[PDB]
Assembly symmetry: C3
Homo-oligomer: 340 residues x 3
């Protein structure tokens, strides 16, 4: 809820407070979700300030404090900055902006990502055009420039990023996406591509110079029915591992699915049903491994706009068998969740 | 300040600004406080949303950014999360909530924590049940389901928390507290007990399958006079070191008292007097030591609901010839502090 | 924006969202600024309770989150608290604070510190009196005790400060500043000094017992016309490297000049001309070398008070022979800034 609003400005402070606990055989260290205390928080700020009838200045910055760390050594673990950027909206010319934000592929993935906690597997962090990424930028368009209603696209070039490290960096890119909601129904596509950096293709798991995430989906957000599914392949991006040869970096080829359905019940029950299989094909000396397979089952409960709590659980589809090592065990998290 | 209060979910964004500096002898390291700059700040938010008549939902977070650090290598010593939790309160059934909050036995330990900077020595953090600790479920209740004004309770489970460090872990616990307030007068005590996990156990100092901390407090609040002292012992919970042999871990046995007399003047002076004795028994090969011995003189002065400042002072009863080597040296704090 | 206000207490929640990019020849390592993504944000707060007519308590804080980071290894990088302090004002007795705050000398440097992005090259941090230190005790006075208009002074005692980084330390100082602004024009000096900690004497570079930076500046800020120029030197003060030999520490002797002039057109463009020359003297064996040289050209384009953006261009007057290693290159900066 917006908490300053003078002068044709409005700074919205927003955040949450999540008591989360995971549950899985032992430390889980090898079920799909893990296990133990998983409690975090959110504190960020949406700002906007039209500089007049058609133009809009704005920025936003959402950080992440973790609630599970001691008050010593490691109090800084998994503290990050999720989003941060500047922008301008200008009539039906459209919008633009730059800083760390959601690659554009996300535009797709989004549809299937709403489990109460888990799901959203396809889309990693810093995976190039599919996650939240460091300096990228975007143009978004508003019903073909206002000409025809509901169909907005965008497009995005993704800056040089030779960070520390393997699964973190990324050479360059264009990328975009076109998209269309028809009262209730809705259909989306998105694709992108970019240089990898030599730290990359010099990893042991990796044959590419240039890779592509593309991805699509049909959703039906209406009347408390939500139906959404995605299919989406990749090329030299999903990042993988081999706790066995313990080696790392990237999976040449992969296919992706996601299914999800939720019904938003009458007093705020809103259980949820979900599917989801990410196979890598052609892993060097592995043939084919499922980086992730599960049905899901669970629900959020909406005390209102501010509170909820949920129970969410993952019936796990890989098994011990599994070529690279994705832990096999189910994991079920329960958590509670205030938010202003 | 409460900065946002709406559709029945208020949010109070809160903190301070704390110009602090210790003075100890020559160099302090062999004092009980430190020496030089201590300055720090405080950001955090409680919010509570009214689901409705007898259902309030609230959350809360509180971080703390040290101010004494440089803007390079280190500007990170000290920041931590202090607090993140979440939950609900039901007219007369009690509460509940979960995350990183206080273990029960502070309900009692607290009373004696009221010195303007020091005092409150027995409540380490991540000490199981006595300081803030992570992953705790905290059921409270009040006036015995509304039945007996002033008579309060609580129970709580303490998570399996395998961090890396010895001094910072904790197998699992229950524990709680009973408390009763009568026209100035406060009676409390509480008690808990949890496994150590093997890594705790495998410390040179440290003998037991089982830790238990407990404690009690009797006090007088009211009429511009604070009167309160505290007593409690420990089973294998109180962390200690041996700077001589750089030996680390815990103390089979301790016994502690806290003693505060304080008084709030018509013009916003409020001096504050203090004892603080924490003896260890059975530290392997040392036998008995005093972890903490002091009287503390010092006072606070309250420009108003927003400002304050003060000078707190510890008269060290430890001495040089102390078997673990607790610092013998008097230490003297001087604080000024805004705070919304 | 000020978000809160009743009862003497006003608080002011404030920040921005700076989306940045550097452009510098090829790999940026030999430029003045770097090159790539740079997108950071600010979060902070000013607070001030009037405890009466004459007396005022404030506190305030300011932290610098970065956005050029993944959300993994490094999420923590180049992040600080810059400012944290508090204290009291008094009709014309004056004023006072402790915490981490700007040093006296800045008060003159603060006049040339204006480039949309670069400039102010002389005010390192954690450099004794020239930028932000931590543990400083500042006294300010207004309109010479209300007596004399625009004449204000201020002495600052500067903390024992022995950190890790050689070049983040400092023994103790005092210092100040008379500042005199007369209808249109502004003319001010500051100086101070103090000891160096030993890890400081120790570096191969810099011969000193005792440091001192002074500086003055002059300006005409009035009418959509800003010119300032600054000049000043330092004893065993400005922090310098020898990328060749890789050695560290301090420039025996340095000399420093700042030249800015910008103009404020009334649809809101406001172009800036910039120049800056810093030169070490007597650097142990390297003797006379160049610490920063360039002419700068760029402009800021306000949308309103709350938005804006700018480009800043460093035309770099160093060259490749440069005894110390100073990159010789130009850099350019695009920026889009929102701020509330």
């Amino acid at each position: 809820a917006e908490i300053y609003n003078k002068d044709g400005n409005k700074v919205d402070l927003y955040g949450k407070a999540v008591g989360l606990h995971y549950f899985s055989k032992g430390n889980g260290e090898n079920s799909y979700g893990g296990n133990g205390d998983m409690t975090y928080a959110r504190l960020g700020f949406k700002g906007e300030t039209q500089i007049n009838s058609d133009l809009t200045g704005y920025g936003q910055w959402e950080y992440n404090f973790q609630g599970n760390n001691s008050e010593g050594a490691d109090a800084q673990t998994g503290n990050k900055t999720r989003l941060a950027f500047a922008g301008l909206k200008y009539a039906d010319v459209g919008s633009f902006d730059y800083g760390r934000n959601y690659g554009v592929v996300y535009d797709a993935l989004g549809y299937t990502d709403m489990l109460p906690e888990f799901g959203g597997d396809t889309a990693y962090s810093d995976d190039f055009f599919v996650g939240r990424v460091g300096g990228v930028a975007t143009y978004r368009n508003s019903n073909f420039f206002g000409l025809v209603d509901g169909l907005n696209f965008a497009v995005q070039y993704l800056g040089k990023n030779e960070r520390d490290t393997a699964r973190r960096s990324n050479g360059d890119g264009v990328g975009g996406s076109i998209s269309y909601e028809y009262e209730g129904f809705g259909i989306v596509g998105a694709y992108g591509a970019a240089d990898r950096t030599n730290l990359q293709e010099a990893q042991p798991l990796g044959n590419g110079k240039k890779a592509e995430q593309w991805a699509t989906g049909l959703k039906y957000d209406a009347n408390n029915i939500y139906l959404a599914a995605n299919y989406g392949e990749t090329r030299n991006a999903t990042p993988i591992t081999n706790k066995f040869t313990n080696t790392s970096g990237f999976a040449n080829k992969t296919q992706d699915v996601l299914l999800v359905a939720q019904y938003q019940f009458d007093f705020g029950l809103r259980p949820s049903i979900a599917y989801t299989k990410s196979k890598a094909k052609d892993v060097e000396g592995i043939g084919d491994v499922d980086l992730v397979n599960y049905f899901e089952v669970g629900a959020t409960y909406y005390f209102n706009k501010n509170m909820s709590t949920y129970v969410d659980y993952i019936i796990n589809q890989i098994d011990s068998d599994n070529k690279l090592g994705v832990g096999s065990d189910d994991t079920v998290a329960v958590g509670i969740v205030y938010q202003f």
